[PDB]
Model the fold of this input.
Amino acid sequence: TTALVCDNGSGLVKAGFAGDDAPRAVFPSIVGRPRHQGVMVGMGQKDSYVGDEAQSKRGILTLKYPIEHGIITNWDDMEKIWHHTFYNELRVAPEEHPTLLTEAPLNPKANREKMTQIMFETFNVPAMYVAIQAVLSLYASGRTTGIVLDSGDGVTHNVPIYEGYALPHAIMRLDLAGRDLTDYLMKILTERGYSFVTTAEREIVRDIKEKLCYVALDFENEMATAASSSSLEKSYELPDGQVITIGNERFRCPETLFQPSFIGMESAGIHETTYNSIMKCDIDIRKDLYANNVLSGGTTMYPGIADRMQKEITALAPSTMKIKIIAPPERKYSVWIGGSILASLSTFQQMWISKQEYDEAGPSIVHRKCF
Amino acid sequence: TTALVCDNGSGLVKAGFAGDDAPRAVFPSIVGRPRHQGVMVGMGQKDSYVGDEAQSKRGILTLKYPIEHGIITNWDDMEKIWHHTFYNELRVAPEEHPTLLTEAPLNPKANREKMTQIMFETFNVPAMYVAIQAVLSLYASGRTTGIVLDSGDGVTHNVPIYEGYALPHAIMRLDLAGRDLTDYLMKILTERGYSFVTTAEREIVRDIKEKLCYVALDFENEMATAASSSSLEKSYELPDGQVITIGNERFRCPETLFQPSFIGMESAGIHETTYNSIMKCDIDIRKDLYANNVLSGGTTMYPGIADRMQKEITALAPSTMKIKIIAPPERKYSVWIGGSILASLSTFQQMWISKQEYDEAGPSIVHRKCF
Amino acid sequence: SDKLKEAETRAEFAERSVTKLEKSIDDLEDELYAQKLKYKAISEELDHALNDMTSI
Amino acid sequence: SDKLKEAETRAEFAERSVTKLEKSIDDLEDELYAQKLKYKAISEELDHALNDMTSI
Ligand SMILES: Nc1ncnc2c1ncn2[C@@H]1O[C@H](COP(=O)(O)OP(=O)(O)O)[C@@H](O)[C@H]1O
Ligand SMILES: Nc1ncnc2c1ncn2[C@@H]1O[C@H](COP(=O)(O)OP(=O)(O)O)[C@@H](O)[C@H]1O
Ligand SMILES: [Mg+2]
Ligand SMILES: [Mg+2]
Done:
């Protein structure tokens, strides 16, 4: 039979059968209970709208993501999300399909063990396998080397790989991602008068960020230009009218990636953690990693980031090496495409964690040889 | 058995069995004791004529409404009105019929508790339920969202509802209604020479208001036109002859709704309390409320109000949203039609306040789960 | 009675005419909605081309 | 007499409604014409761009 390539993610759940080009169903991972009282009788009001249904009734819900930073903080809601994904968005019972979840690097063990225990006890799948979210993004590019920066919505991690041999001592995981950029944008919009507070209006700020923000090639020059002319002010129409005008908030929101001091984080930007991740590698594979830097994940879709990052790394790196940044147009679904490719391989067909194996060793089987 | 859908109102009591299209008996709610001496013996003169009987002998009575502004100020008279409604206008003993009263929003608790205590002790009904007068008017329109402006004769209230979830923090109750318009019309008629003072002549002024007054589309232009031409002066024949001619009093009486400063009230008109009630709602359900504005209640029957209100709201609202005002021809009985529909539902059949429940918790049961 | 019949006939025609006008305005509002969707789509496509070209 | 008054009031209401509807439909037609004008202007600009791109 065919395998189910699910990809929990944090912000958008992407799923679909193995062997295709794009995920079949992509929908936000939010579960929102209603918060008001409700007076109409017999309206058929449910107790929790999940997935894309709660992005249409969000006016009277309190949306809450079940995955904070890679890790899962609310297991009941995550179980509800998985149940919805299997039964309503794909309509395939899990009793007859292997599953291939994905997990960020350096995550707590208990999260992974609970994930496999749920998949084997509640949904009762035949066999499931958990894979690191960066190796798949490297599969999708058709490479076999390279250092991949997978800046998702929950957590940004940077896994270097050479000739198929991952370097476990050079993984640099940073917890700045799309959600923190949404919060920072929502916080700097208040400088013009627009106040978004409700958890429903966070979605509106996210839409503003997606449609308007861009990464500046040079930050100081843009700050000077936006403060003199008015060629940058782009307007946007809220879900009820009252258009708003975003000035130099456009390139200040995604600039947080390269200067995490804006949101008070100490660490260095995504332009310098990649160079540090490279320098921890051996001295003989640094040229190949320099030449095959891969971008993935949703947050790396800002217009103009593949040039800013290249300029920064070229500034840091030695002058002789060639710096090349692979930015495929299908960046958002790169991890899932790689997952489909991996699940479609014949050599991989014996790596699944078969159910009888789980019955013999318990949920701690995932840390064992079947990784 | 069948349920009795009574609707106390203030000015017209509307009642009838559940499941029909129109109330069975509609009659003014006035109780008038005779005031003169009376010399004929054996004429069979009663001590209080209630309902529609006192609108025919009003020449020698002192009519007094038992409901001032939604609240009930004279409990003995209200009990008399209910007794008349049950026994003479419907001729069904209340011992064998559930009742569904209606109550304005934000009314004093003691009024509701006394109402249920009367219904359970004096008339001894099997089970009664109290419902907010705006949710029913939303039932009758066949919608499930929308903001309903129920401008009755006692009190005008504006309850917004979305997807069946009422928003308790956005109810704007204003005490200007048909009665104040009658008093203001009676007060401005004195500018031509016609003086109505007696409580019986208030009924004549009410008839004048119903038959002649209309809401102007633009107030200043109408004031200018009525002051130059004479195409507006419509005449009306009193109950004894001596026709009267109403000039620009025609559209000045109902204009008080949109400018409550005429009768000295501070608050804003019904055109601006609806917009304020909308703006208190969340940012994502404002479009639906804009598109589904519902009118109900008697006082919204003035010829030309559904256009004036739409023009005013379109002036206030953002230019992109579409403003639509639902004004069904059966506006007057909209609340009662909705009450019949609600009482006819199977899902609602277990929400009644059964008598044994009242015996166990006292009259304060109404504020509890059985709302 | 004759005057009542005449007035009722004219009022019925007026009701029919306002129904026709409301249907016509519904049609034209729908057409304007479609053209607004057209402009939204064309502006979105132009922005997509702009971001693709600026981002290679 | 009661019936005649009812009919007359109905006629006046319907006439006023038809007047409002006519004005509104004319205004919306004007708005649609304006948006079509904007679309045609940008379309002619893009057509000039295509004419130059023929040399590209
Ligand atoms: N076109 C875009 N432009 C800018 N940011 C985007 C765009 N699309 C998605 N994002 C950001 O990326 C996030 C989605 O990232 P995604 O790759 O789905 O995370 P995950 O790894 O959990 O699947 C969104 O929250 C949004 O903030
Ligand atoms: N055809 C009409 N035109 C204008 N005003 C009316 C008309 N019919 C009723 N009214 C006004 O509405 C009041 C009746 O309102 P109603 O809806 O019966 O109040 P309630 O909510 O108490 O039932 C009357 O007092 C009268 O002033
Ligand atoms: Mg991801
Ligand atoms: Mg009422």
